Design a protein around this motif. Structure first.
Motif, PDB file in Angstrom:
ATOM      1  N   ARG A  79       6.384 -10.169  -8.260  1.00 34.50           N
ATOM      2  CA  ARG A  79       5.144 -10.929  -8.334  1.00 34.50           C
ATOM      3  C   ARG A  79       5.034 -11.984  -7.242  1.00 34.50           C
ATOM      4  O   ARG A  79       4.011 -12.669  -7.167  1.00 34.50           O
ATOM      5  CB  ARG A  79       5.011 -11.589  -9.707  1.00 34.50           C
ATOM      6  CG  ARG A  79       4.728 -10.600 -10.818  1.00 34.50           C
ATOM      7  CD  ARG A  79       5.134 -11.132 -12.176  1.00 34.50           C
ATOM      8  NE  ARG A  79       4.887 -10.152 -13.230  1.00 34.50           N
ATOM      9  CZ  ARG A  79       3.728 -10.000 -13.862  1.00 34.50           C
ATOM     10  NH1 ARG A  79       2.690 -10.764 -13.558  1.00 34.50           N
ATOM     11  NH2 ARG A  79       3.607  -9.077 -14.804  1.00 34.50           N
ATOM     12  N   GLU A  80       6.057 -12.127  -6.400  1.00 34.44           N
ATOM     13  CA  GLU A  80       6.012 -13.013  -5.247  1.00 34.44           C
ATOM     14  C   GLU A  80       5.990 -12.262  -3.924  1.00 34.44           C
ATOM     15  O   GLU A  80       5.996 -12.901  -2.868  1.00 34.44           O
ATOM     16  CB  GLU A  80       7.212 -13.966  -5.264  1.00 34.44           C
ATOM     17  CG  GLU A  80       7.341 -14.775  -6.535  1.00 34.44           C
ATOM     18  CD  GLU A  80       8.379 -15.870  -6.421  1.00 34.44           C
ATOM     19  OE1 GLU A  80       8.116 -16.991  -6.897  1.00 34.44           O
ATOM     20  OE2 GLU A  80       9.457 -15.611  -5.846  1.00 34.44           O
ATOM     21  N   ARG A  81       5.976 -10.931  -3.949  1.00 29.34           N
ATOM     22  CA  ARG A  81       5.985 -10.145  -2.723  1.00 29.34           C
ATOM     23  C   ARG A  81       4.583 -10.097  -2.137  1.00 29.34           C
ATOM     24  O   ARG A  81       3.633  -9.702  -2.819  1.00 29.34           O
ATOM     25  CB  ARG A  81       6.481  -8.726  -2.983  1.00 29.34           C
ATOM     26  CG  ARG A  81       7.891  -8.642  -3.484  1.00 29.34           C
ATOM     27  CD  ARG A  81       8.305  -7.205  -3.693  1.00 29.34           C
ATOM     28  NE  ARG A  81       9.737  -7.104  -3.934  1.00 29.34           N
ATOM     29  CZ  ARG A  81      10.653  -7.177  -2.979  1.00 29.34           C
ATOM     30  NH1 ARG A  81      10.292  -7.355  -1.717  1.00 29.34           N
ATOM     31  NH2 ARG A  81      11.936  -7.084  -3.289  1.00 29.34           N
ATOM     32  N   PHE A  82       4.452 -10.503  -0.879  1.00 35.63           N
ATOM     33  CA  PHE A  82       3.178 -10.383  -0.190  1.00 35.63           C
ATOM     34  C   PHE A  82       2.895  -8.917   0.099  1.00 35.63           C
ATOM     35  O   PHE A  82       3.688  -8.241   0.762  1.00 35.63           O
ATOM     36  CB  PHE A  82       3.184 -11.200   1.097  1.00 35.63           C
ATOM     37  CG  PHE A  82       2.675 -12.601   0.923  1.00 35.63           C
ATOM     38  CD1 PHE A  82       1.329 -12.882   1.073  1.00 35.63           C
ATOM     39  CD2 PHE A  82       3.536 -13.633   0.604  1.00 35.63           C
ATOM     40  CE1 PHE A  82       0.854 -14.163   0.913  1.00 35.63           C
ATOM     41  CE2 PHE A  82       3.063 -14.917   0.441  1.00 35.63           C
ATOM     42  CZ  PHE A  82       1.721 -15.182   0.595  1.00 35.63           C
ATOM     43  N   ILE A  83       1.777  -8.421  -0.420  1.00 30.11           N
ATOM     44  CA  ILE A  83       1.304  -7.069  -0.157  1.00 30.11           C
ATOM     45  C   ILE A  83      -0.143  -7.194   0.288  1.00 30.11           C
ATOM     46  O   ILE A  83      -1.011  -7.560  -0.513  1.00 30.11           O
ATOM     47  CB  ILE A  83       1.425  -6.159  -1.391  1.00 30.11           C
ATOM     48  CG1 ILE A  83       2.863  -6.168  -1.916  1.00 30.11           C
ATOM     49  CG2 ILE A  83       0.999  -4.740  -1.052  1.00 30.11           C
ATOM     50  CD1 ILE A  83       3.036  -5.486  -3.252  1.00 30.11           C
ATOM     51  N   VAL A  84      -0.404  -6.888   1.557  1.00 34.19           N
ATOM     52  CA  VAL A  84      -1.697  -7.144   2.173  1.00 34.19           C
ATOM     53  C   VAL A  84      -2.272  -5.831   2.677  1.00 34.19           C
ATOM     54  O   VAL A  84      -1.558  -4.849   2.886  1.00 34.19           O
ATOM     55  CB  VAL A  84      -1.600  -8.165   3.326  1.00 34.19           C
ATOM     56  CG1 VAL A  84      -1.153  -9.513   2.796  1.00 34.19           C
ATOM     57  CG2 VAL A  84      -0.647  -7.671   4.402  1.00 34.19           C
ATOM     58  N   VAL A  85      -3.587  -5.828   2.872  1.00 35.73           N
ATOM     59  CA  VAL A  85      -4.331  -4.635   3.247  1.00 35.73           C
ATOM     60  C   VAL A  85      -5.214  -4.979   4.436  1.00 35.73           C
ATOM     61  O   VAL A  85      -6.008  -5.924   4.370  1.00 35.73           O
ATOM     62  CB  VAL A  85      -5.182  -4.102   2.082  1.00 35.73           C
ATOM     63  CG1 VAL A  85      -5.950  -2.863   2.507  1.00 35.73           C
ATOM     64  CG2 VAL A  85      -4.305  -3.810   0.880  1.00 35.73           C
ATOM     65  N   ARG A  86      -5.078  -4.218   5.517  1.00 35.56           N
ATOM     66  CA  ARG A  86      -5.963  -4.322   6.671  1.00 35.56           C
ATOM     67  C   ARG A  86      -7.041  -3.254   6.524  1.00 35.56           C
ATOM     68  O   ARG A  86      -6.758  -2.058   6.629  1.00 35.56           O
ATOM     69  CB  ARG A  86      -5.185  -4.157   7.975  1.00 35.56           C
ATOM     70  CG  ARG A  86      -6.042  -4.232   9.233  1.00 35.56           C
ATOM     71  CD  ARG A  86      -6.590  -5.627   9.478  1.00 35.56           C
ATOM     72  NE  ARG A  86      -5.565  -6.529   9.992  1.00 35.56           N
ATOM     73  CZ  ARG A  86      -5.798  -7.764  10.419  1.00 35.56           C
ATOM     74  NH1 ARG A  86      -7.027  -8.259  10.400  1.00 35.56           N
ATOM     75  NH2 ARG A  86      -4.799  -8.506  10.870  1.00 35.56           N
ATOM     76  N   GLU A  87      -8.269  -3.687   6.274  1.00 38.24           N
ATOM     77  CA  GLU A  87      -9.373  -2.770   6.061  1.00 38.24           C
ATOM     78  C   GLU A  87      -9.965  -2.320   7.392  1.00 38.24           C
ATOM     79  O   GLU A  87      -9.764  -2.966   8.421  1.00 38.24           O
ATOM     80  CB  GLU A  87     -10.452  -3.436   5.212  1.00 38.24           C
ATOM     81  CG  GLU A  87      -9.994  -3.845   3.826  1.00 38.24           C
ATOM     82  CD  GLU A  87     -10.147  -2.729   2.815  1.00 38.24           C
ATOM     83  OE1 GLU A  87     -10.126  -1.550   3.223  1.00 38.24           O
ATOM     84  OE2 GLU A  87     -10.292  -3.029   1.612  1.00 38.24           O
ATOM     85  N   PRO A  88     -10.701  -1.206   7.400  1.00 39.15           N
ATOM     86  CA  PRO A  88     -11.359  -0.782   8.645  1.00 39.15           C
ATOM     87  C   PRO A  88     -12.361  -1.792   9.162  1.00 39.15           C
ATOM     88  O   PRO A  88     -12.638  -1.809  10.367  1.00 39.15           O
ATOM     89  CB  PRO A  88     -12.043   0.534   8.253  1.00 39.15           C
ATOM     90  CG  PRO A  88     -11.326   0.998   7.038  1.00 39.15           C
ATOM     91  CD  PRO A  88     -10.918  -0.241   6.313  1.00 39.15           C
ATOM     92  N   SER A  89     -12.911  -2.640   8.291  1.00 36.45           N
ATOM     93  CA  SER A  89     -13.791  -3.716   8.725  1.00 36.45           C
ATOM     94  C   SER A  89     -13.052  -4.801   9.494  1.00 36.45           C
ATOM     95  O   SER A  89     -13.703  -5.671  10.080  1.00 36.45           O
ATOM     96  CB  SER A  89     -14.496  -4.332   7.517  1.00 36.45           C
ATOM     97  OG  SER A  89     -13.565  -4.931   6.634  1.00 36.45           O
ATOM     98  N   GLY A  90     -11.721  -4.777   9.498  1.00 36.15           N
ATOM     99  CA  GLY A  90     -10.927  -5.792  10.153  1.00 36.15           C
ATOM    100  C   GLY A  90     -10.426  -6.887   9.240  1.00 36.15           C
ATOM    101  O   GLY A  90      -9.679  -7.758   9.699  1.00 36.15           O
ATOM    102  N   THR A  91     -10.800  -6.864   7.966  1.00 35.90           N
ATOM    103  CA  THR A  91     -10.401  -7.908   7.035  1.00 35.90           C
ATOM    104  C   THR A  91      -8.968  -7.684   6.576  1.00 35.90           C
ATOM    105  O   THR A  91      -8.604  -6.580   6.161  1.00 35.90           O
ATOM    106  CB  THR A  91     -11.342  -7.931   5.830  1.00 35.90           C
ATOM    107  OG1 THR A  91     -12.625  -8.424   6.230  1.00 35.90           O
ATOM    108  CG2 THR A  91     -10.782  -8.812   4.726  1.00 35.90           C
ATOM    109  N   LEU A  92      -8.156  -8.732   6.658  1.00 35.53           N
ATOM    110  CA  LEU A  92      -6.809  -8.736   6.104  1.00 35.53           C
ATOM    111  C   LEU A  92      -6.868  -9.419   4.744  1.00 35.53           C
ATOM    112  O   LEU A  92      -7.075 -10.633   4.662  1.00 35.53           O
ATOM    113  CB  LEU A  92      -5.839  -9.453   7.038  1.00 35.53           C
ATOM    114  CG  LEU A  92      -4.367  -9.425   6.629  1.00 35.53           C
ATOM    115  CD1 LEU A  92      -3.813  -8.013   6.683  1.00 35.53           C
ATOM    116  CD2 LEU A  92      -3.560 -10.356   7.510  1.00 35.53           C
TER     117      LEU A  92
END
Lengths: 215, 295
Positions: free
Chosen positions: B105-118
């Motif tokens: 629950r402390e692991r950073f899991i991020v998503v880079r969308e095709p729109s460029g949003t992280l």
């Protein structure tokens, strides 16, 4: 009608005779059993093979052993014995293990009513020695109640599928001892190198643990 | 001022632990699995009583109740909006920090969308990604089909509610919306068909009571406890109900009448209980059989 008969050996024996030269007779070994612990075996001899079949099977039912079975499916404990030169090592097994034994032992076990057992036959593989050696070992197995009575203690079964739950399988009918059984730090029991070599994984055989038909 | 108890309060855990019960034959039922030949020990009456005591301790661990958590709030946090990357990728990237010694629950899991949003991965993406890289035995990356409404009714018809809860516990996090939806649908099927005995001597009985008490639907369980001569459990249930609904018609009635023991069930049956008539009758029957045994 409750008993089934199985053939274990049919041999042609040749007797040299004073006037008639080499004559041919038949020696047959058959086992009988009802599938509920009562089983026996007898030798049959006759000039005709079908007269020998009659003699052995009829005689076998008058020499029946009673074989104790744990939960009516396996033996009560591991049995390792030698009869003459034939060694038989039998292992108590759980349900679903099946009969993974010498084909003759499989046949005899179905007559007795044993469903789950491992057996290894070494030394001389003599059918008669194997049969009477097997019946001698199965007739001298101590049940859990006999162990409880002999030692005046509870017999408690620990199963890994049931976790730490202690299952009392037998309790002494007479008084119950108050002094715990001495805990020998190291038992002086003789071990089978085959069993130890297996437990350690050093036992590699291309013929062991092969896939076989349900027995 | 005056806080209402939580599921993990020592007073509530004690009440729910006793109402659950401990049955060593059910708690340690033989499992259908690969078997080994059993071992045997010669024991005195004392050595046996000690082994049975240890089994009770091992069972109280196996019956430890899972904490009841509230539904988790959806994650919608943007870390960056790099518009220069808009339209340069057709598929989104999911980045998972797989550093070993971090709580999940402390692991950073991020998503880079095709729109460029992280952006931070959603709760569903997180639980899926943690299973990919930190696979947990009994959990699947794709949701099993057993949790569909059509397949749960099959499991309920077979009285396999504990398996449903074991399957749900292994697949979903305790605060997930799927975890709570399944537990509530399972608790309701038990309440409708009176299958409260299926969860006794399991770690899921307390959560079930917690659900009934908070939703003010203990009439079915209260009848089941009386019909089984568990008045100590039935009386604790009415007390837990009063503790969690202090400003209620039944809690006041007990204060005004200083009710205790079986009297609490009579007060509860008249004021707040929906099946007040069926409880008094069920309670009357119990008092009769108790008088017959006394006489």
């Amino acid at each position: 009608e409750d008993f089934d008969t199985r053939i274990l050996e049919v041999r042609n024996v040749f007797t040299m005779t004073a006037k008639e030269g080499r004559k041919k007779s038949i020696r047959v070994l058959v086992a009988v059993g009802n599938g509920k612990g009562a089983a026996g075996f007898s030798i049959g001899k006759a000039t005709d093979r079908m007269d020998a079949f009659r003699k052995a099977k009829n005689r076998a039912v008058h020499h029946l052993h009673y074989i104790e079975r744990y939960e009516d499916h396996t033996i009560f404990h591991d049995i390792s014995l030698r009869f003459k030169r034939t060694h038989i090592k039998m292992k108590k097994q759980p349900k679903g293990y099946g009969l993974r034994c010498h084909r003759a032992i499989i046949t005899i076990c179905r007559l007795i009513g044993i469903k789950d057992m491992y057996a290894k036959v070494s030394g001389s593989i003599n059918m008669l020695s194997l049969t009477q050696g097997l019946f001698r070992g199965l007739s001298r197995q101590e049940t859990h109640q006999q162990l409880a009575d002999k030692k005046g203690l509870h017999v408690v079964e620990i199963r890994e599928e049931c976790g730490p739950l202690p299952i009392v399988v037998a309790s002494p009918r007479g008084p119950l001892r108050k002094d715990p059984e001495p805990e020998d730090e190291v038992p002086d029991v003789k071990l089978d190198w085959e069993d130890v070599k297996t437990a350690q994984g050093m036992k590699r055989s291309v013929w062991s643990n092969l896939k076989r038909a349900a027995t | 001022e005056t806080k209402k108890p939580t599921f993990m309060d020592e007073e509530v855990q004690s009440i729910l632990t006793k109402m659950t019960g401990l049955n060593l034959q059910k708690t340690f039922k033989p499992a259908i699995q690969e078997l080994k030949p059993p071992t045997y020990k010669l024991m005195t009456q004392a050595q046996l009583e000690e082994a049975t005591r240890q089994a009770v301790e091992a069972a109280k661990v196996r019956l430890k109740m899972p904490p009841v958590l509230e539904e988790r709030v959806p994650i919608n946090d943007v870390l960056a909006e790099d518009k220069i990357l808009e339209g340069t990728e057709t598929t989104k990237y999911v980045f998972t920090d797989i550093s070993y010694s971090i709580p999940h629950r402390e692991r950073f899991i991020v998503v880079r969308e095709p729109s460029g949003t992280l952006r931070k991965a959603s709760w569903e993406e997180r639980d899926r990604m943690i299973q990919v890289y930190f696979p947990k035995e009994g959990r699947k990356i794709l949701t099993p089909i057993i949790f569909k409404e059509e397949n749960l009714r099959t499991m309920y018809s077979q009285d396999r509610h504990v398996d449903v809860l074991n399957l749900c516990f292994a697949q979903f996090e305790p605060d997930s919306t799927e975890y709570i939806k399944v537990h509530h649908k399972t608790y309701e099927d038990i309440d409708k068909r009176g299958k409260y005995d299926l969860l006794r001597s399991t770690r899921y009985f307390g959560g079930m009571v917690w659900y009934f008490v908070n939703n003010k639907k203990i009439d079915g369980l209260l009848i089941d406890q009386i019909q089984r001569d568990l008045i100590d459990d039935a009386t604790n249930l009415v007390q837990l109900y009063h503790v969690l609904h202090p400003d209620g018609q039944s809690a006041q009635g007990a204060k005004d009448q200083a009710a205790e023991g079986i009297n609490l069930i009579k007060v509860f049956a008249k004021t707040e209980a929906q099946k007040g008539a069926y409880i008094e009758l069920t309670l009357q029957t119990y008092q009769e059989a108790l008088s017959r045994h006394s006489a």
